Enzyme design. Structure first.
Site, short mmCIF file in Angstrom:
data_model
loop_
_atom_site.label_atom_id
_atom_site.label_comp_id
_atom_site.label_asym_id
_atom_site.label_seq_id
_atom_site.Cartn_x
_atom_site.Cartn_y
_atom_site.Cartn_z
N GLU A 121 54.07 55.17 -27.88
CA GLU A 121 53.79 56.40 -27.14
C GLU A 121 52.31 56.52 -26.74
O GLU A 121 51.65 57.51 -27.06
CB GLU A 121 54.23 57.63 -27.93
CG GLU A 121 55.72 57.66 -28.27
CD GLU A 121 56.21 59.00 -28.76
OE1 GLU A 121 55.40 59.94 -28.85
OE2 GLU A 121 57.43 59.12 -29.05
N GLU A 123 63.35 55.45 -30.46
CA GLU A 123 63.35 56.76 -31.11
C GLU A 123 64.35 57.69 -30.44
O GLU A 123 64.40 57.80 -29.20
CB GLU A 123 61.99 57.45 -31.13
CG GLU A 123 60.93 56.72 -31.96
CD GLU A 123 59.64 57.50 -32.11
OE1 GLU A 123 59.61 58.72 -31.80
OE2 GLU A 123 58.62 56.86 -32.53
#
Ligand SMILES: [Cl-]
Ligand SMILES: [Cl-]
Ligand SMILES: [Cl-]
Length: 483
Positions: free
Chosen positions: A204, A381
């Site tokens: 991320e 995720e």
């Protein structure tokens, strides 16, 4: 039933900073993240919760128990990171022209690797080897990620930067960090390649740029509000990814990808489809076009082009957008901008974090990536803040069904990794946001199976959503929940 390919793996992802600490001798006090969440001013401002990561779930000491439970749950894949700060807790020798904006090459050679080795914390390295060996002995496939936000303090003092002082280690604002990240990544692959199945450079990176330098109420370091510096950080992060890719490839032939925070952009009305395209451009395609196509602002850098083997999709919820006079805007009351434990403006339930239930977005994101780049993917995720476990059984089955749909449409998706196996430190939210299949008692460090963990075991052990649990492919009933 909805069956998955025989080679498809169900698993989990977790982060070192968020899960490792909590057992004796496990504390890592040497990151920007650690300084940030202990800072008295940040606490007083309520930028951080006051919860401290050293009181966490204790994976550093208790990893065998985590892995035991994963094995019993039928999981076959894990994504974890090594914490850079644990490996190099003290600073490295300086190299390299800091004033050069572009970093087109970072040389990796045997002598440089052997010199880096002199500065590495061998106790940490050995312990990580023990953890990863235990993991592999469970027959778990292993994705090793190099970076999940915390940097060594010797590369970033986030309080100094928060205060507007740019004369010290400035994190992703400094090309020194780009150089050192490439060398660190090469070093870790050199040391661990025998255990690793696939690599990710980062997790991320868009959060670093976006929350660090724009979304400054979020309590993400260094919390310095600047469009210009957000851009500089992201530019450097892009170069760091490419140099780390090349660095890993100099010592390994295994696949190297990256993990990204995604949203599914949805139109408020049938006239807002152009706003969706602009949002995808501004939040997703600019980044991936840079590391896959070498395109940056409008030129092509041959040192950036082609530096990706696979894409890790992190997905939680949607973002609703509408067209405006000049461009588009995101709307409150949907997606991640909802009240907690309530319903969105669309009547869909929201999590403990105020995130809207929207599984169709995962199909959208997976298929958009596939059609644009045709690189294979993992869902790295997906999960929900839900201590009570009211919504998670539905959230799990629904999103897993959307991955089945994506595969059916032709997208090459090779596994689904839930966030997370157990509850963990959710940065500025502390421990209050509970994403685990397993509930953690932070006083005893005991792990408990929420019913969703039993549901996940049924999926993973059968490699399918079985007939018996197909009803969970549905929205949690809203009438019995808080509005
Ligand atoms: Cl996205
Ligand atoms: Cl392409
Ligand atoms: Cl607790």
């Amino acid at each position: 039933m909805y069956s998955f390919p025989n080679s498809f793996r169900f698993g989990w992802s977790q982060a070192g900073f968020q899960s490792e600490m909590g057992t004796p001798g496990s504390e890592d006090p040497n990151t920007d993240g650690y300084k940030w969440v202990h800072d008295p001013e940040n606490m007083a401002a309520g930028l951080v919760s006051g919860d401290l990561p050293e009181n966490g779930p204790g994976y550093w000491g208790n990893y065998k128990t985590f892995h035991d439970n994963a094995q019993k749950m039928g999981l076959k894949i894990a994504r974890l990171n090594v914490e850079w700060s644990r490996i190099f807790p003290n600073p490295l020798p300086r190299p390299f022209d800091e004033s050069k904006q572009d970093v087109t090459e970072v040389e990796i050679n045997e002598n440089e690797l052997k010199r880096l080795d002199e500065y590495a914390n061998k106790d940490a390295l050995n312990h990580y080897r023990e953890i990863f060996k235990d993991l592999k002995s469970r027959g778990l496939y292993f994705i090793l990620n190099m970076y999940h936000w915390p940097l060594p303090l010797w590369l970033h003092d986030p309080i100094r930067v928060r205060r507007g002082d740019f004369t010290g280690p400035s994190g992703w604002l400094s090309t020194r960090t780009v150089y050192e990240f490439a060398r660190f990544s090469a070093y870790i692959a050199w040391k661990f390649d025998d255990l690793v199945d696939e690599y990710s450079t980062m997790n991320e990176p868009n959060v670093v740029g976006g929350l660090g330098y724009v979304g400054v109420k979020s309590g993400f370091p260094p919390g310095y509000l600047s469009f210009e510096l957000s851009r500089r950080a992201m530019y450097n992060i892009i170069q760091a990814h490419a140099r780390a890719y090349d660095g890993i490839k100099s010592v390994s032939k295994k696949p190297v990808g990256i993990i990204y925070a995604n949203s599914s952009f949805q139109p408020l009305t049938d006239k807002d489809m152009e706003a969706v395209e602009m949002a995808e451009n501004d939040n997703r395609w600019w980044f991936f076009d840079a590391i896959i196509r070498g395109e940056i602002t409008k030129i092509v850098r041959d040192d950036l082009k082609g530096r990706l083997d696979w894409i890790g999709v992190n997905y939680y919820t949607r973002t609703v957008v509408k067209r405006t006079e000049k461009g588009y805007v995101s709307l409150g009351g949907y997606g991640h901008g909802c009240e907690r434990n309530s319903v969105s403006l669309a009547g869909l339930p929201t999590s403990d974090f105020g995130w809207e239930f929207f599984p169709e977005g995962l199909y959208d994101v997976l298929t958009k990536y596939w059609n644009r780049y045709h690189l294979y993917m993992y869902v790295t995720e997906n999960g929900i803040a839900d201590d009570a476990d009211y919504q998670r059984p539905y959230y799990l089955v629904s999103h897993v069904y959307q991955v089945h749909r994506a595969i059916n449409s032709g997208a090459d998706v090779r596994g689904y990794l839930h966030w997370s196996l157990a509850d963990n430190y959710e940065w500025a939210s502390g421990f209050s946001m509970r994403f685990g299949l397993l509930k953690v008692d932070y006083n005893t460090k005991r792990l408990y199976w929420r019913p969703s963990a039993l549901v996940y075991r049924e999926i993973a052990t059968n490699g399918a959503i079985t007939d018996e649990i197909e009803h969970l492919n549905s929205v949690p009933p809203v009438k019995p929940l808080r509005h």
